[PDB]
Design an enzyme around this catalytic site. Structure first.
Site, PDB file in Angstrom:
ATOM      1  N   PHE A   1       0.852  -1.185   0.000  1.00  0.00           N
ATOM      2  CA  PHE A   1       0.000   0.000   0.000  1.00  0.00           C
ATOM      3  C   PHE A   1       0.882   1.228   0.000  1.00  0.00           C
ATOM      4  O   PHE A   1       1.868   1.276   0.778  1.00  0.00           O
ATOM      5  CB  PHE A   1      -0.888  -0.060   1.262  1.00  0.00           C
ATOM      6  CG  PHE A   1      -2.084   0.831   1.248  1.00  0.00           C
ATOM      7  CD1 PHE A   1      -3.311   0.368   0.771  1.00  0.00           C
ATOM      8  CD2 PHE A   1      -2.031   2.108   1.841  1.00  0.00           C
ATOM      9  CE1 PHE A   1      -4.446   1.212   0.783  1.00  0.00           C
ATOM     10  CE2 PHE A   1      -3.154   2.940   1.834  1.00  0.00           C
ATOM     11  CZ  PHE A   1      -4.358   2.489   1.325  1.00  0.00           C
TER      12      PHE A   1
ATOM     13  N   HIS B   1       0.409   7.695   2.049  1.00  0.00           N
ATOM     14  CA  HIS B   1      -0.842   8.318   2.330  1.00  0.00           C
ATOM     15  C   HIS B   1      -0.810   8.914   3.690  1.00  0.00           C
ATOM     16  O   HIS B   1       0.070   8.577   4.530  1.00  0.00           O
ATOM     17  CB  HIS B   1      -2.021   7.329   2.283  1.00  0.00           C
ATOM     18  CG  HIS B   1      -1.965   6.279   3.329  1.00  0.00           C
ATOM     19  ND1 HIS B   1      -1.049   5.245   3.282  1.00  0.00           N
ATOM     20  CD2 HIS B   1      -2.599   6.183   4.512  1.00  0.00           C
ATOM     21  CE1 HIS B   1      -1.199   4.502   4.372  1.00  0.00           C
ATOM     22  NE2 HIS B   1      -2.167   5.038   5.118  1.00  0.00           N
TER      23      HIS B   1
ATOM     24  N   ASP C   1      -3.605   9.252   7.010  1.00  0.00           N
ATOM     25  CA  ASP C   1      -4.781   8.494   7.505  1.00  0.00           C
ATOM     26  C   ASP C   1      -6.025   9.424   7.501  1.00  0.00           C
ATOM     27  O   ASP C   1      -5.921  10.615   7.809  1.00  0.00           O
ATOM     28  CB  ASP C   1      -4.629   7.946   8.956  1.00  0.00           C
ATOM     29  CG  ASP C   1      -3.751   6.655   8.999  1.00  0.00           C
ATOM     30  OD1 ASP C   1      -3.291   6.260   7.881  1.00  0.00           O
ATOM     31  OD2 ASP C   1      -3.543   6.027  10.085  1.00  0.00           O
TER      32      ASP C   1
ATOM     33  N   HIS D   1       2.905   7.729   5.480  1.00  0.00           N
ATOM     34  CA  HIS D   1       3.452   6.414   5.691  1.00  0.00           C
ATOM     35  C   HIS D   1       2.954   5.506   4.635  1.00  0.00           C
ATOM     36  O   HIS D   1       2.060   5.859   3.849  1.00  0.00           O
ATOM     37  CB  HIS D   1       3.085   5.956   7.098  1.00  0.00           C
ATOM     38  CG  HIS D   1       1.633   5.899   7.352  1.00  0.00           C
ATOM     39  ND1 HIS D   1       0.883   7.033   7.616  1.00  0.00           N
ATOM     40  CD2 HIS D   1       0.771   4.852   7.410  1.00  0.00           C
ATOM     41  CE1 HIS D   1      -0.378   6.703   7.748  1.00  0.00           C
ATOM     42  NE2 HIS D   1      -0.476   5.384   7.617  1.00  0.00           N
TER      43      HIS D   1
HETATM   44  C1  LIG Z   1      -0.758   0.209   8.814  1.00  0.00           C
HETATM   45  O1  LIG Z   1      -1.755   0.336   7.840  1.00  0.00           O
HETATM   46  C2  LIG Z   1      -3.038  -0.133   8.298  1.00  0.00           C
HETATM   47  C3  LIG Z   1      -3.939   0.674   9.185  1.00  0.00           C
HETATM   48  C4  LIG Z   1      -3.735  -0.846   7.152  1.00  0.00           C
HETATM   49  N1  LIG Z   1      -4.180   0.145   6.167  1.00  0.00           N
HETATM   50  C5  LIG Z   1      -5.436   0.576   6.134  1.00  0.00           C
HETATM   51  O2  LIG Z   1      -6.299   0.114   6.885  1.00  0.00           O
HETATM   52  C6  LIG Z   1      -5.759   1.705   5.144  1.00  0.00           C
HETATM   53  C7  LIG Z   1      -4.713   2.888   5.179  1.00  0.00           C
HETATM   54  S1  LIG Z   1      -4.687   3.686   6.808  1.00  0.00           S
HETATM   55  N2  LIG Z   1      -7.060   2.297   5.479  1.00  0.00           N
HETATM   56  C8  LIG Z   1      -8.076   2.330   4.618  1.00  0.00           C
HETATM   57  O3  LIG Z   1      -8.025   1.757   3.536  1.00  0.00           O
HETATM   58  C9  LIG Z   1      -9.348   2.956   5.114  1.00  0.00           C
HETATM   59  C10 LIG Z   1     -10.308   1.916   5.584  1.00  0.00           C
HETATM   60  C11 LIG Z   1     -11.581   2.549   6.290  1.00  0.00           C
HETATM   61  C12 LIG Z   1     -12.667   1.504   6.518  1.00  0.00           C
HETATM   62  N3  LIG Z   1     -13.070   0.717   5.304  1.00  0.00           N
HETATM   63  C13 LIG Z   1     -13.873   2.324   7.100  1.00  0.00           C
HETATM   64  O4  LIG Z   1     -15.013   2.255   6.432  1.00  0.00           O
HETATM   65  O5  LIG Z   1     -13.716   2.976   8.173  1.00  0.00           O
HETATM   66  C14 LIG Z   1      -2.812  -1.855   6.490  1.00  0.00           C
HETATM   67  O6  LIG Z   1      -2.673  -1.602   5.211  1.00  0.00           O
HETATM   68  O7  LIG Z   1      -2.247  -2.775   7.109  1.00  0.00           O
HETATM   69 FE   LIG Z   2      -2.467   4.419   7.230  1.00  0.00          FE
END
Ligand SMILES: CO[C@@H](C)[C@@H](NC(=O)[C@H](CS)NC(=O)CCC[C@H](N)C(=O)O)C(=O)O
Ligand SMILES: [Fe+3]
Length: 329
Positions: free
Chosen positions: A209, A212, A214, A268
């Site tokens: 990923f 971005h 958060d 990050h």
């Molecule tokens: C460390 O990154 C973590 C939080 C995780 N990434 C994510 O969860 C990514 C970027 S923060 N977040 C997202 O994609 C947002 C999801 C929101 C969720 N569907 C809601 O409806 O509230 C991962 O990719 O392991």
């Molecule tokens: Fe994140």
């Protein structure tokens, strides 16, 4: 080759109690961490993370393909028009490795006024069949409340850190209306791991990923003990060490807005690692109509030239933009 980011371990246990001086000493550490790399580990948080890991593993390893379609969000299953946020996010073998299950406030029930009104970003949770996943829904809903508790305590720390009364954020973070979500993310081991599921950063780093900020006030994250996160600093991208006994905490772009970038939302990204691991974020979101007036802790009068933004507005457009920028997860 890549240097270790400074990610302090902060004992947040005073944030649950009534020792105001001890709370201010924690608040200082959060200020420090928030002004430096923007990450810290919350330790002595009181949450049984090993049990969370175990329950989550039992679920991910027993859910079937049939169940996943039945629970799928709209982006995977056109029949589920109401499921924009909550439900199952499928993998695409050969293309996309990650899969996950997201759930919202358990208090968003069919009778909830915001569900009645069909307000965007509010949904009723979907769950697998209880006989197939005994105890799972009850476990997951209780987890929501345990991490909600932790989160409230953290928010008391951030408020103190910013020179405010401890309920400055927490008063907008309420059981009955929080838009906060849990995501139970599975990052699989694959042999061979398809190149199509691996992205490459400008600097050559293999990612799952991209970079971005958060979409959150703060993000409260449990992961497996497998290093994966990097943070952009003035000294380039640095590795965030794993600690599967703590929660990794960082600010989202809502906190950035509120504080006029005194507490930046750190940029990050997630490195590609060929390992079976878990990434279990709680996104600390406020209520749909929560508005905090923006301020600036580096300015004498505290005033900011930023306009108030309601959390619901922020969240709905944030989540769309992040999908646009970084892809449907
Ligand atoms: C460390 O990154 C973590 C939080 C995780 N990434 C994510 O969860 C990514 C970027 S923060 N977040 C997202 O994609 C947002 C999801 C929101 C969720 N569907 C809601 O409806 O509230 C991962 O990719 O392991
Ligand atoms: Fe994140």
């Amino acid at each position: 080759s890549v240097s270790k980011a400074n990610v302090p371990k902060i004992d947040v246990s005073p944030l649950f109690g009534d020792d105001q001086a001890a709370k201010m000493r924690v608040a200082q550490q959060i200020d420090a961490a928030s002004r430096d790399t923007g990450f810290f580990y919350a330790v002595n948080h009181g949450i049984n993370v090993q049990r969370l890991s175990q329950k989550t593993k039992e679920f991910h390893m027993s859910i079937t393909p049939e169940e996943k379609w039945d629970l799928a969000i709209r982006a995977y299953n056109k029949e589920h028009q109401d499921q924009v946020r909550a439900g199952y996010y499928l993998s695409i073998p050969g293309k996309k490795a990650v899969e996950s299950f997201c759930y919202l406030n358990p208090n968003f029930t069919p009778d909830h006024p915001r569900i009645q009104a069909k307000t965007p970003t509010h949904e009723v949770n979907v769950w697998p069949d209880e006989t197939k996943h005994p105890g799972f829904q009850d476990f997951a809903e209780q987890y929501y409340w345990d991490v909600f508790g932790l989160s409230s305590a953290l928010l008391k720390g951030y408020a103190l850190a910013l020179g405010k009364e401890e309920n400055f954020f927490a008063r907008h973070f309420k059981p009955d209306d929080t838009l906060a979500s849990v995501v139970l993310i599975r990052y699989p081991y694959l042999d061979p791991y398809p190149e199509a599921a691996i992205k490459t950063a400008a600097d050559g780093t293999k990612l799952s990923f991209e970079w971005h900020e958060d979409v959150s006030l703060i993000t409260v994250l449990y992961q497996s003990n497998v290093q994966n996160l990097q943070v952009e600093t003035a000294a380039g991208y640095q590795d965030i060490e794993a600690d599967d006994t703590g929660y990794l905490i960082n600010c989202g772009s809502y906190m950035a807005h509120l504080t006029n970038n005194y507490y930046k939302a750190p940029i990050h990204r997630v490195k590609w690692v060929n390992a079976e691991r878990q990434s279990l974020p709680f996104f600390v979101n406020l209520g749909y109509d929560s508005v905090i007036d923006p301020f600036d802790p580096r300015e004498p009068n505290g005033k900011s030239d930023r306009e108030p933004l309601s959390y619901g507005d922020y969240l709905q457009n944030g989540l769309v933009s992040l999908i646009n920028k970084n892809g449907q997860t």
